[PDB]
Amino acid sequence: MFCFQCQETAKNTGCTVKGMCGKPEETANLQDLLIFVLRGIAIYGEKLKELGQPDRSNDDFVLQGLFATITNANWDDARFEAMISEGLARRDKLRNAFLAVYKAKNGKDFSEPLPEAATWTGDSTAFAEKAKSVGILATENEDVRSLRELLIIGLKGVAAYAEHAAVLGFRKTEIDEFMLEALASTTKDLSVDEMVALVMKAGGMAVTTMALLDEANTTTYGNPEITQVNIGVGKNPGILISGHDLKDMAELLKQTEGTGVDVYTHGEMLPANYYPAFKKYPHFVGNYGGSWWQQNPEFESFNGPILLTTNCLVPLKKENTYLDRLYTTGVVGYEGAKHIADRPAGGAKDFSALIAQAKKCPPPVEIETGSIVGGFAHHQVLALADKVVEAVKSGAIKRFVVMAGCDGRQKSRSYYTEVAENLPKDTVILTAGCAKYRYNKLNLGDIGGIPRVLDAGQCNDSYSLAVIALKLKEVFGLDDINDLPVSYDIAWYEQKAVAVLLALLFLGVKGIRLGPTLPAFLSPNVAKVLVENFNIKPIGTVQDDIAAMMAGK
Numbered sequence: 001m002f003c004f005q006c007q008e009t010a011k012n013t014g015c016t017v018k019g020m021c022g023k024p025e026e027t028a029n030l031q032d033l034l035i036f037v038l039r040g041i042a043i044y045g046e047k048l049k050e051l052g053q054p055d056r057s058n059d060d061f062v063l064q065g066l067f068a069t070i071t072n073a074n075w076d077d078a079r080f081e082a083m084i085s086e087g088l089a090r091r092d093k094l095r096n097a098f099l100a101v102y103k104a105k106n107g108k109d110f111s112e113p114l115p116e117a118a119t120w121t122g123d124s125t126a127f128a129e130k131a132k133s134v135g136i137l138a139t140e141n142e143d144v145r146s147l148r149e150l151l152i153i154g155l156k157g158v159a160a161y162a163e164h165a166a167v168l169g170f171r172k173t174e175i176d177e178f179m180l181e182a183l184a185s186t187t188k189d190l191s192v193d194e195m196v197a198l199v200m201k202a203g204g205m206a207v208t209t210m211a212l213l214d215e216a217n218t219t220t221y222g223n224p225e226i227t228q229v230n231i232g233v234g235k236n237p238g239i240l241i242s243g244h245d246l247k248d249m250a251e252l253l254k255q256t257e258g259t260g261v262d263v264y265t266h267g268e269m270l271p272a273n274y275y276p277a278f279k280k281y282p283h284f285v286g287n288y289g290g291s292w293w294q295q296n297p298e299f300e301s302f303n304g305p306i307l308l309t310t311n312c313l314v315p316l317k318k319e320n321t322y323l324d325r326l327y328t329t330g331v332v333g334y335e336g337a338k339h340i341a342d343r344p345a346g347g348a349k350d351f352s353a354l355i356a357q358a359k360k361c362p363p364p365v366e367i368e369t370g371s372i373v374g375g376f377a378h379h380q381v382l383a384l385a386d387k388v389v390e391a392v393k394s395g396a397i398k399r400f401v402v403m404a405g406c407d408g409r410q411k412s413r414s415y416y417t418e419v420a421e422n423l424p425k426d427t428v429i430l431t432a433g434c435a436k437y438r439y440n441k442l443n444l445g446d447i448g449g450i451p452r453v454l455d456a457g458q459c460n461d462s463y464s465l466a467v468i469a470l471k472l473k474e475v476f477g478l479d480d481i482n483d484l485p486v487s488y489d490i491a492w493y494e495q496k497a498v499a500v501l502l503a504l505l506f507l508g509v510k511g512i513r514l515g516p517t518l519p520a521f522l523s524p525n526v527a528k529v530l531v532e533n534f535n536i537k538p539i540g541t542v543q544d545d546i547a548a549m550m551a552g553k
């Protein structure tokens with residue numbers, strides 16, 4: 001196999017036998033074949049748009065297919081086989097439409113050779129062998145490989161956010177068109193300039209999509225507000241919801257109301273606690289545990305059903321007993337888990353089986369007590385802008401440090417905890433994404449009532465952090481966003497973080513520290529382009545990085 005799309009990739013080079021995440025060769029290869037088929041869809045879809053007869057019938061399929069290949073999203077080879085077969089059928093429909101339109105517009109049959117992605121077909125028994133030759137290593141040149149895979153990795157992250165927006169009824173044609181432009185581009189022989197421009201365009205589309213998702217989440221569930229979230233437990237059986245999807249949360253809360261089953265969040269569902277639409281339910285207890293990588297013991301000790309709405313779901317340890325109460329939904333899949341089918345148009349998912357099972361479970365084992373404060377998304381922070389601006393001009397706040405992104409397993413991530421602990425007492429940490437769990441249970445206090453850790457929400461709520469920076473740029477009358485008293489020390493793991501990074505680069509943010517390592521999918525020459533254009537940096541020691549950040553470097 002070959003996969004290098006996450007921070008934990010083997011030797012920071014690539015997983016070649018079995019993924020460090022647990023992904024077996026067969027699964028890895030099937031994900032490659034799915035992406036191959038999506039490239040085929042894209043070739044015809046792009047051509048149809050160019051001919052003035054766009055077909056948007058595959059929009060959701062494309063988003064879901066990309067999302068299913070995110071790290072820790074889908075482990076079920078049966079699901080991939082089904083998606084690949086469906087993809088081939090969708091592709092062939094587009095092919096036939098294209099051929100007819102091309103002939104009408106040109107007065108002759110289409111005759112140009114196409115990449116194999118556009119033409120190869122087989123039944124499911126042919127997939128395993130074909131998959132071996134259509135993956136990342138099919139691109140021989142390391143710079144072409146790096147730029148194509150950077151694009152697809154960023155694109156998957158964008159697709160995830162676009163899927164959540166689509167679930168909520170929010171779509172933009174430009175996003176779905178760009179999915180096909182980007183995918184099709186990776187079958188073409190393009191210059192480095194063209195390939196880099198596509199990556200920058202993806203960053204701009206990450207801005208568009210993150211804005212759309214922010215609109216969707218806040219229009220539907222309200223603006224996040226300051227909330228104190230309990231991290232202890234009650235004495236009722238509960239259902240633990242993890243991942244990111246807020247519509248699943250809305251439906252789970254409605255369906256559990258009055259049943260005697262409590263609802264708890266986990267991981268990237270913590271920010272559901274911040275939304276007024278959800279705060280109204282008394283049986284929504286709070287948040288259980290930490291970030292995704294601790295889930296084996298935590299899902300175990302929770303005792304009730306666990307619902308994974310998105311990544312990250314990790315393989316069960318052999319000693320874990322929660323498979324029989326593990327539920328997947330959306331793009332998530334896991335062999336032997338129970339999957340909750342997609343909602344029908346105008347309807348709702350059916351969580352009744354989780355509720356019935358939860359009534360037979362003991363309540364959660366308490367693993368800590370206390371609280372986490374959050375809800376500082378853009379409406380909330382902009383409301384406080386006068387107070388923040390006066391604190392900066394008076395010197396009470398010397399600097400903001402953006403420490404958003406993803407958590408993960410590697411012990412080097414103690415860096416993030418130590419930075420939070422050792423930053424001067426006149427700084428404020430801004431966060432979003434599960435990177436927060438390295439420092440959100442500390443006792444860092446406040447500056448004149450502004451907490452020293454401001455949690456804007458999920459990784460997608462990095463959007464709020466960008467909105468806040470842009471607003472402060474205006475209030476302070478600065479010409480360059482980088483001259484704000486803000487430093488960026490971002491942790492990354494999976495592909496949504498790459499989308500966020502590309503958005504920040506598109507917005508012109510330079511000097512970002514990215515860690516705890518730099519992506520394996522940046523070739524030396526491509527890394528040089530990013531350093532030259534954007535001054536991206538690796539992490540150093542805690543002491544050195546704090547000093548440099550306080551100096552604005």
Ligand code: SF4
Binds near residue numbers: 005010
């Ligand atoms: S998702 Fe990450 S750990 Fe898993 S196979 Fe790919 S690079 Fe390796």
Ligand code: SF3
Binds near residue numbers: 243267312433435459
């Ligand atoms: Fe939405 S941030 Fe990226 S790592 Fe897996 S849930 Fe976390």
